[PDB]
Amino acid sequence: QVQLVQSGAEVKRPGSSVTVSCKASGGSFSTYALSWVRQAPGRGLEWMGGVIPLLTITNYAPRFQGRITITADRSTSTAYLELNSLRPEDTAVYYCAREGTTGWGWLGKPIGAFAHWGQGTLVTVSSASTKGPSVFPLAPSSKSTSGGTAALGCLVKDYFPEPVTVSWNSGALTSGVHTFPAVLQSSGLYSLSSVVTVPSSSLGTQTYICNVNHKPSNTKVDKKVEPK
Amino acid sequence: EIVLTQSPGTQSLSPGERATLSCRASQSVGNNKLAWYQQRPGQAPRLLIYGASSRPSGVADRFSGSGSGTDFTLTISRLEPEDFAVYYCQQYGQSLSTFGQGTKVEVKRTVAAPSVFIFPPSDEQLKSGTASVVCLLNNFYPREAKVQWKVDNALQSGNSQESVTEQDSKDSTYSLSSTLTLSKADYEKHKVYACEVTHQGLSSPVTKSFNRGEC
């Protein structure tokens, strides 16, 4: 096996300190290197540091040193990444990575590289306040229609934090749907759009509804998009 | 600090073909401690290669890594659909490990010009005192598109934002959205609203326009 399970997402504040955990199950823990590797919104992977649980042999990255701590709990096979002086820049997905071993036949002999990963943990660092989105209809008009096709949608605006998930007609509308990655507005809130192309002969003879789901806010709205 | 330089930035080619990704280190990577990971869209990295040459068990033969010292190359021999993702190189030859900025392997198709649609601010939103005009560039290739907002012929400055989907699993196109944001007025003290688009698939820009009324 060798399964790594991280804690739920987190919303911390600038200046705050966050602690993320990783649970290893199905292989030796104390004797294998365990590193943390984050990934900022729309960017690559950055290695932050690691630790060999045995003697708590720690390896920190200069960019983070004197600001980050990495721990192991041999008695519970768990690892901890604590990071303070949180800045909005630190908004990223933090990954727990355990190195692989020669020949999975099985656990035995380190290889340095990270063969095992957690599901990732979203940590958002903002001074903004959690809020569900306002959902406005992108109505089908003569300017959104051409030939036999017509584009409609809905603007999911001013929410926080990530993520939001959209669907159409309770999922009864799959192909033609494009949901764009959210962009960070100046107010510090996110916003995005969900569109879909549909036959235009079916506009009056049909009803289109976008179901929005912002779990971090316990919000679940449904907006009816119809002609202009 | 050792810098891993990955190129090209985006390698675009057809399935069933062979992909060769380049990783060059600013310094000599000791003991050839180099790994290649594959990150598929919404997932976590998947280790493909280590020690430059070594492939774990579970990784398909398609993947081969070579090079040494300061020049490393990842090689997929016959691309499968799932192979179109991002690839990262990491060096662990010294304590401070580092990653390359990554390389995207995109499906190459025939150029397609964006289908431009335009949506006026909903009344529901205007009742809030803020307006948002949306401009959808739908189903185009490549992903490089230029959008420009124009209100009463006046060109626009940093009051719009655009988002781009990832390449489409089904038809390999990209879609983009550009939102212009205003206050009720001055949205109400301007007549026409248009967005013009420049794409490698068009000889002339495409301009979608509407005037406060229709519908």
Partner: peptide, 16 residues
Amino acid sequence: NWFNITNXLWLIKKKK
């Protein structure tokens, strides 16, 4: 090289 240490250890545990 921090990344090697686990080798030092696996070699000992095996050794004895």
